[PDB]
Amino acid sequence: TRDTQLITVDEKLDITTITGVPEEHIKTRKARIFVPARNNMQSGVNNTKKWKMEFDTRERWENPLMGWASTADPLSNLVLTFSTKEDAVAFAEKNGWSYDVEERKVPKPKSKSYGANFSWNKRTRVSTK
Amino acid sequence: SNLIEVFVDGQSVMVEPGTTVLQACEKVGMQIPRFCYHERLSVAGNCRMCLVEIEKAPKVVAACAMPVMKGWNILTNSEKTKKAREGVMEFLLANHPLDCPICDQGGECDLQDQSMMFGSDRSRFLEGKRAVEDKNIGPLVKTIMTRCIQCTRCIRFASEIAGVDDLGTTGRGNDMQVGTYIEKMFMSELSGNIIDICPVGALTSKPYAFTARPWETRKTESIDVMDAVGSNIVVSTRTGEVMRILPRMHEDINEEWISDKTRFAYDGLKRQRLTEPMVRNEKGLLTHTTWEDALSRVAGMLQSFQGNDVAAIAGGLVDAEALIALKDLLNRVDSDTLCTEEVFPTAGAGTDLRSNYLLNTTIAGVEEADVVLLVGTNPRFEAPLFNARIRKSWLHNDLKVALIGSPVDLTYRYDHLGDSPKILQDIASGSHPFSQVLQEAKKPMVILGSSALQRNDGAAILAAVSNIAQKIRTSSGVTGDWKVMNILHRIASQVAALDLGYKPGVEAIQKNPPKMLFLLGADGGCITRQDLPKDCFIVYQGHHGDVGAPIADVILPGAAYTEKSATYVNTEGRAQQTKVAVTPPGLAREDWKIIRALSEIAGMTLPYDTLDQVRNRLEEVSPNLVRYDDVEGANYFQQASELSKLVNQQLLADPLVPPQLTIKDFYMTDSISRASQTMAKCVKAVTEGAH
Amino acid sequence: PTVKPPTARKFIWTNHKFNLSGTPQQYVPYSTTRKKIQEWVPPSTPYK
Amino acid sequence: TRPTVRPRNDVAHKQLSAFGEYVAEILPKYVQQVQVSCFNELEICIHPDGVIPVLTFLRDHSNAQFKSLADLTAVDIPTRQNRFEIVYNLLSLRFNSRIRVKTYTDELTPIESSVPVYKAANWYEREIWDMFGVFFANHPDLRRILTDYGFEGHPFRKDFPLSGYVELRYDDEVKRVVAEPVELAQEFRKFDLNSPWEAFPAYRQPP
Amino acid sequence: ASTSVKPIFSRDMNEAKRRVRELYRAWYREVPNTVHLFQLDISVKQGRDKVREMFKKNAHITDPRVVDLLVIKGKMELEETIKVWKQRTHVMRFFHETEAPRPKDFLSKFYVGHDP
Amino acid sequence: GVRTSPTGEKVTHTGQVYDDGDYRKVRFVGRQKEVNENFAIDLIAEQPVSQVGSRVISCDGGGGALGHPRVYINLDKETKTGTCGYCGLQFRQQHH
Amino acid sequence: LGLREIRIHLCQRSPGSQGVRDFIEKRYVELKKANPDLPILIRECSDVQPKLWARYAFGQEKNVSLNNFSADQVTRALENVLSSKA
Ligand code: SF4
Ligand code: SF4
Ligand code: FES
């Protein structure tokens, strides 16, 4: 294989000290790892394919001059994308973020029958089309 | 071995018989375009947007309705399919109005998006367009029917899901119109859902009109607290303000629906809010103060009272973290008078066994039942999404439903056995003919409403219903794993309080009136100052000034369910948590942090300083409270029934009357909804009228 | 404009203004929206 | 041909494919994947140990002669175990052709400096170190090049916030510019723009 | 295995620790020049205590590669100071002189806002 | 139009006005509160209703491509006018 | 100073809770008869180690692990709690 002499390191991978993040935004943050829910206003499912990581929402207040929404949270907009739940968890662990994982919610397969609309003796008979 | 082999663009997929072409493409991750098809509605096949080419078949088929046949190769991207989509999209847009800038659907419109992905990029329609009159169907759903594409989703939803047959089509051809023909309001507890299913801007939220565009909103996935179903929701916020509530799919709870109160009562969060601590001044009036001063006043009283001199009542919207914090604080002055407004009989097992106060069959288990007996409940209004599940099973599983109580309109036909509670005696003994139907049933389900347990004879009713359930379950007919006895709760905080060892009801407080009363969001008015010693020191903690706050000595502004990460347990015993969508207003604070801060001032510091720590505390009291999205089964029905028969209590003669008889009683049932201006318009509409 | 005058509108300023910065007529920004959260107003009478 | 559709060049596509196989046959020890894009760009994906050998061969071999290092950059992909993709874009004036060589690394694995092969790489690797935090072994002078002195973090990482963590102002009490945690009078507004409908079937991924 | 990795400079923590102590000595001797050269208003004692505080906060590391990068970054920081690429503002940014002390107890945080 | 609050501050066409105890009105001392005095709600109401002889009429706001997207307005209801969603002009069917 | 509340945590299926499950099925009803006004909260949750919690006056709590206990050991563990205050 390699000509480069490797070493053995059994430490858990932790990069908190070399990321430059302030202490406040490592230990007091909660990361949420989830697959986004489908926007119920539309039938397209293409935004439910990937895993996302977001952070706990913090205060927003009104700017005295204009009424704009101010924030002191540097992570308020950070959203990361991941192929699998395991990739998202691995990223959160090595960055030292506490996290919750929410299992993916796949719609269950349905039994669809057009003929059922015209049942002779069942309640599925439609009164209109 | 019943699966057949079909191909999607040449890739083999094995599907069960009856699978449609559209469902076969789903299995390989290909989403066929659609407008009329909805997987939770009856197939319609009228929009023709799902047309697809079958290899070697000269005619395109409607993928949403065509059953796939063995060996078929579905070409989802052939020129023939693409030309069919372009042709259909062209017809849809010919008469559609140029409304996108003024239409609320813009930015989350399936017509816009499928036009971009599957339609042409230009128009060759050189005529004038159709224009249609608008229909008024109430104060929740705005109609701009010139945008309607006649997909009939709303008609099929109203008929099949909501059980209302007010929507139809009138006329013929290009002038065919969706509506009610006469002037009629589509007032149903599930009406707001026709906004979501409508693919276009024809049906939109009237309260939401013009306020935001979809791309600019932030989505906070959360839980509903308007009832005990625990509907999953998305809270849309923009620049720190709540904008709307949308459903979030959960197959085992609300599917993809929510009730109108869940959808539209959020505007009550902007009114009558408690934003600053308040104390009584020398003139006996509530005046704003600091957190330091308000807590010092409360801490001083708490340090001078012990035992039965201290008590607490928890209202219907309190979270588990706040409940456990208050219980721990009152336990540290050796007080056990931790009460809830909602009664649940303490006779027999009481709250010792979870199975005694849960919906043991679970919401999704209704679809497996073959008989349902409803007792003293109007599920249509107490748990609208649970009632929709019953109608779904009534529709598709031919479920038999019987009701003991007032004959309310459940949106499906049922068997009314009467309203006297003595019928429960007949069914148990076998005298009643319906007793035989339960014995026949393989999977009977008996549901007792928490509202029926507010009667002074609630222990007798629960014993009677449990006697019916146990005579059935421990006998031939039902498997060992099928659970028959169910309680249907209507209060979001009730099950968590029971899990934590609270006393249900305020009988304990009435027996031994206290000198210091904590009202934790308690706005039912069950205990007023006429029931307390003249000098009672009342502390109200909550988010709305309503019933509890006016009579308090100290007001501590807490947060609403949109403003905290809090645990709620639904009627099945499933623990779920909200997420912060916006922070609490003004000086309001997370509710468990108020109690934790109070304990530090009082010299009784609780042993948790973070949310995770107070949740570790929840695990020590009831481990299921931190098992989020899991339903933990509860056993020992026989033991509960043995303790239930020890004391025989006599049923009262008065018939079972649900607190909610008509839709007008549905809209306002808690502090948030009572402050909602939208809910007030709904009450006016159903009472006065459209005028 | 003596040859091709501008189209007349009722809302067009009849009196043009020069740059008002640094004077008492200067523009001062402010939020044009109304208060969003209404706070509860306690009753003006003692409990009892 | 179609006036709005970019025309394909099949001769260049075949030439680049044949040369890609040529490279993979000569350096099997390092080449992991070779691909040619539909707009005719050749990418050689290699094991990170092959940086110096592969780049040296491409520069000096008679049938390659990629004398010019057009650009050297990195890409951060948090979902990968080796989140950092290192991209070398090379130009051959002799054969009027371009090639892209890619490798990978994580936060703790050094990459070998290519300054011996291309002296152009000196500042490009300082920029990668500064912006991504990738260390380059045996670099003559590796240090920040674009960020402020003492700046903490690597701002082109996908998990570094757009507005950073600190901001500057002049403070009259201490008579100097000072750094303080970032507060924004108007928060940056995140927009969700992705359509929930698939745009490109040709790129669909297995479920 | 997946634990067989490429080192940066140190093949184990004992080699890494030597580099840490060498970096610490270099910083320790630089502080008097830095205070003089940048005409800082802090004492040499304050500067050296700040150096010790920075080393202590990373005392819990057990991965030699992480320690290697900490030393690499620490040496870049030292070079910026010695060569006077930094200005006095950059040196004084370690001391947060204009930042008010944020409360640390539960009650004090409770009174001011919503953050834990 | 432009009315005034009890404190003397003008009310904007969006209804904005600092209340009595709002310190933020200090920003207007020695300066002024910019208010636009042509309230569009009052101006559109002055316009007369167009009488047309058909069930459906179209509006593009006038000026062709200088107006708004062309929309078609149904005039079947006789208890109200048809209003243009873009420019607010009103139409009424004559006779029928 | 006396006992205020009893909580029994256990799993529905794990063998480590088999004795606790036996105690409930055989003896809980009799235990509740003798102690009519004592809360005895039985809370089942999958994959938890069984435990007995006793809450005494002024919020003091003791927990006893019941892992792999027999029904009789559970009885004696409950007897000590009911008898000895804390
Ligand atoms: S329904 Fe869709 S396409 Fe029609 S006007 Fe509204 S946003 Fe535009
Ligand atoms: S109103 Fe909406 S849901 Fe109903 S038929 Fe028209 S487009 Fe379909
Ligand atoms: S989705 Fe199949 S015809 Fe409408």
Ligand SMILES: [K+]
């Ligand atoms: K809609």
Ligand SMILES: [Zn+2]
């Ligand atoms: Zn117009």
